[PDB]
């Protein structure tokens, strides 16, 4: 009925604003001395050349990279194709690169830019051997495939109805030419369906994928010539992925079933289960060769495996060290794929008959990277990964998220370095809610099941605590969440909490921002019967006035446009009426979340500057 703090929902209200100034002020005298000091060896780390996009062409490989203030885009032997410092001097302006496309013969290319924090992008379809600028398409457009002279794209309408007259958020295909332009695919599709196509690997059939939600699909399959023949051959429920039409049959990955991933095939109304369903799930696949090639997710990490066409698995592939593994783009006679791990930034590997090593980035260092289990209240196994330096000051930084189907997966983060160097551990809990265990591993933390996601971190916290590690928690959106939520439930199983751009009011997050988007996940506040299971967990609803509590830091970005501040706010307050020890850091740059690489390096090293100092 009545909220208190509802106030600062309204983030230009002076009360609100004076909290901001006094807080970041009070924050910034706890920690600011030491992380001046730390900040060289963050950005040392941040700084690294690290891989974005990858794509193949017949004059070969071109790729991104991001470089201390710098994105560039090159040819992967030669020279650079598009700096992001030429074009700030083509504007004077600020400019960030978001991705690329090729044709396959490599002699267009297409990139999109945002110049300053504006909203609207930009696309520039330029001659590989020029350099010249053949078109400039604004607002930015995506899904840029080439075919002949012209392309299909899509463009995702936010503002503004779609031409055929539909309200956003809604997205339509379409086709450019000398000629003109024309909307060759989407009429109707009310707000939420989301599509793209791909070509098939011969390039003869287009590939294209409903989705509603982040939740159910379809696939439309023909010939690249014609739209109007792009029919509809596959019906899901659940995600699925349409990877290949080779030889006239559909490949497909579905997480229909049990919820791991399997590899079905269509061949004109007929389907038959090229790769069943296994122990773990399958995330991906792409086909090359006459071979299915695979990523297997091993307790959170990937394993490679190679298919005939038929479904038989010919080998397995595994790392030295636990990694993520993804494909970077594919042609008839190979693959690139992007590995990344805990203190391996990037590899880019080249799979054609086998898996080489085409480049790498690691971080030297006796590092180490080990797993264990805890025991979660109703037994669940909740796996986790170790990451070591060469001494233990039995000092824990614990990374969990739980929910979205998102995987918590090995991969890179600069600030940790530094803590693993000063005898820190890190530690990424696999809980309920994210996809490691296919399909009900995620329901299982969704609704009335969210109290699993926290019991499982808890399980993990409890137990680094009882091996005498001090523990800080740490976690981001949904992931703020998770710490907020832990530590009003059991403050006694950690040293610190690191909350970021949190949710935490879990009875009107639908009325803020887009956080109706959550509601598939979370549950709907308008429903009594939801508000039952949401009231006990909420973070902002169950601050216990008679706990005594960890030092808290809150931090969240004021220009933040998807999770709103005032959840971050409304927590904080709620904390400090009770007196517990708490900080709010709240970031001042705005436009897209990451200001710039220094701005976001400066808040990451905050973080580390408060674990230290909390756990020292
Ligand atoms: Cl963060
Ligand atoms: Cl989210
Ligand atoms: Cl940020």
Redesign the pocket.
């Known amino acids: 009925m009545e909220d208190p703090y509802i106030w600062m929902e309204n983030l230009e209200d002076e009360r609100v604003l004076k909290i901001i100034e006094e807080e970041n002020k009070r924050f910034r005298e706890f920690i600011g001395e030491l992380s001046d000091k730390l900040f060289p060896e963050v950005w040392e780390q941040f700084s690294q050349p690290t891989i974005g996009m990858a794509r193949i062409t017949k004059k070969g490989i071109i790729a991104s990279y991001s470089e201390k203030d710098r994105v560039v885009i090159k040819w992967f032997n030669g020279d650079v194709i598009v700096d992001s410092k030429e074009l700030e001097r083509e504007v004077g302006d600020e400019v960030l690169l978001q991705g690329f496309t090729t044709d396959e013969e490599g002699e267009k290319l297409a990139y999109s830019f945002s110049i300053g924090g504006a909203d609207e992008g930009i696309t520039r379809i330029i001659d590989l051997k020029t350099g010249e600028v053949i078109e400039e398409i604004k607002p930015s457009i995506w899904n840029i495939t080439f075919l002949k002279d012209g392309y299909y794209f899509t463009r995702f309408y936010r503002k503004e109805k779609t031409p055929d007259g539909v309200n956003p958020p809604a997205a339509r295909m379409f086709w450019k030419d000398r000629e003109g332009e024309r909307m060759v695919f989407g009429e109707g599709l009310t707000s939420g369906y989301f599509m793209s196509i791909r070509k098939s690997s011969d390039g003869k059939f287009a590939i294209v994928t409903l989705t509603y939600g982040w939740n159910q699909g379809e696939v439309y399959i023909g010939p690249i010539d014609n739209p109007q023949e792009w029919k509809k051959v596959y019906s899901a429920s659940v995600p699925v992925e349409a990877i290949d039409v080779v030889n006239g049959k559909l490949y497909i990955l579905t997480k229909e079933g049990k919820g791991l991933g399997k590899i079905i095939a269509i061949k004109n109304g007929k389907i038959d289960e090229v790769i069943p369903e296994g122990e773990f799930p399958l995330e991906w696949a792409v086909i090359v060769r006459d071979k299915i090639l695979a990523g297997r997710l091993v307790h959170a990490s990937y394993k490679l495996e190679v298919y005939t066409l038929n479904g038989e698995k010919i080998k397995e592939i595994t790392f030295d060290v636990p990694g993520s593994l993804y494909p970077l783009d594919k042609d008839e006679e190979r693959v690139l794929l992007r590995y990344t791990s805990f203190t391996i930034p990037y590899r880019l590997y080249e799979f054609k008959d086998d898996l080489r090593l085409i480049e790498e980035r690691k971080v030297e260092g006796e590092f180490r990277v080990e797993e264990d289990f805890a025991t979660s209240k109703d037994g669940t196994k909740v796996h986790y990964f170790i990451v070591k330096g060469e001494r233990d000051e039995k000092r824990a930084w614990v990374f969990g998220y739980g929910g979205f189907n998102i995987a918590l997966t090995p991969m890179f983060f600069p600030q940790v370095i530094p803590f693993l160097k000063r005898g820190g551990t890190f530690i990424m809990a696999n809980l309920r809610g994210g996809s490691e265990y296919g399909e009900e591993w995620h329901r299982a933390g969704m609704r009335e099941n969210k109290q699993n996601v926290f019991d499982d971190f808890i399980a993990v916290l409890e137990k680094l605590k009882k091996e005498g590690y001090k523990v800080a928690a740490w976690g981001?959106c949904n992931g703020g969440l998770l710490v907020s939520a832990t530590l009003t439930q059991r403050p006694d199983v950690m040293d610190s909490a690191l909350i970021?751009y949190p949710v935490i009011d879990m009875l009107r997050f639908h009325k803020l921002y887009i956080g109706s988007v959550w509601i598939p996940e979370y549950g709907n506040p308008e429903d009594p019967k939801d508000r039952e299971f949401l009231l006990k967990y909420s973070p902002y609803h169950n601050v216990d006035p008679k706990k005594k509590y960890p030092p808290t830091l809150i931090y969240t970005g004021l220009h933040d446009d998807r999770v709103h501040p005032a959840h971050a706010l409304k927590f904080f307050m709620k904390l400090k009426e009770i007196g517990a020890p708490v900080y709010l850091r709240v970031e001042t740059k705005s436009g897209h979340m990451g200001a710039s690489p220094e701005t976001r390096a400066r808040?990451?090293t905050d973080?580390l500057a408060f674990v230290l100092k909390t756990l020292s």
Do not use: A, I
């Open positions: 981001r970021g808040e990451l973080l």
